[PDB]
Amino acid sequence: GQNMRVAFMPWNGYNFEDSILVSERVVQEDRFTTIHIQELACVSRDTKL
Amino acid sequence: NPIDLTVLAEYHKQIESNLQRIERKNQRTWYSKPGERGITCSGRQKIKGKSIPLI
């Protein structure tokens, strides 16, 4: 993963049991963006008709 | 001199023989057997779902 600046404090309840708050600097630096690759095939079939 | 449809039977036999030759060739080179190694590809076809109303 990546290493980040973290403060341990209760901030307005947005981290109530185990939730995490994330500032938009982590989004704008796009440092958890992930590439995914799907695959799809298509066959020509010898049916009748 | 009775009536005659021998040419009809020859024509129908010609149609049947030509169609049997073409369909035998197509069913010969489309359902062939692969040799000593097996099917060299795979089908992989999958169908997903849609949102179909019922009016």
From Swiss-Prot, chain A:
The RNAP catalytic core consists of 2 alpha, 1 beta, 1 beta' and 1 omega subunit. When a sigma factor is associated with the core the holoenzyme is formed, which can initiate transcription. DNA-dependent RNA polymerase catalyzes the transcription of DNA into RNA using the four ribonucleoside triphosphates as substrates. Belongs to the RNA polymerase beta chain family. This is DNA-directed RNA polymerase subunit beta.
Curated annotation (Swiss-Prot), chain B:
The keyword Transport does not apply. Keywords: DNA-binding, Transcription, Transcription regulation, Transcription termination. One of its GO terms (biological process) is regulation of transcription by RNA polymerase II. One of its GO terms (molecular function) is RNA stem-loop binding. It comes from the Viruses. Residues 33-55 are annotated as: Disordered. Interacts with host nusA. Plays a role as a transcriptional antitermination factor that allows the virus to initiate its lytic phase. Activates expression of the delayed viral early genes by modifying host RNA polymerase (RNAP) into a form that is resistant to termination signals. This antitermination function requires the host NusA protein which serves to stabilize the interaction between antitermination protein N and host RNA polymerase. This is Antitermination protein N. It comes from Escherichia phage lambda. The lineage of its organism: Viruses, Duplodnaviria, Heunggongvirae, Uroviricota, Caudoviricetes. The gene is N.
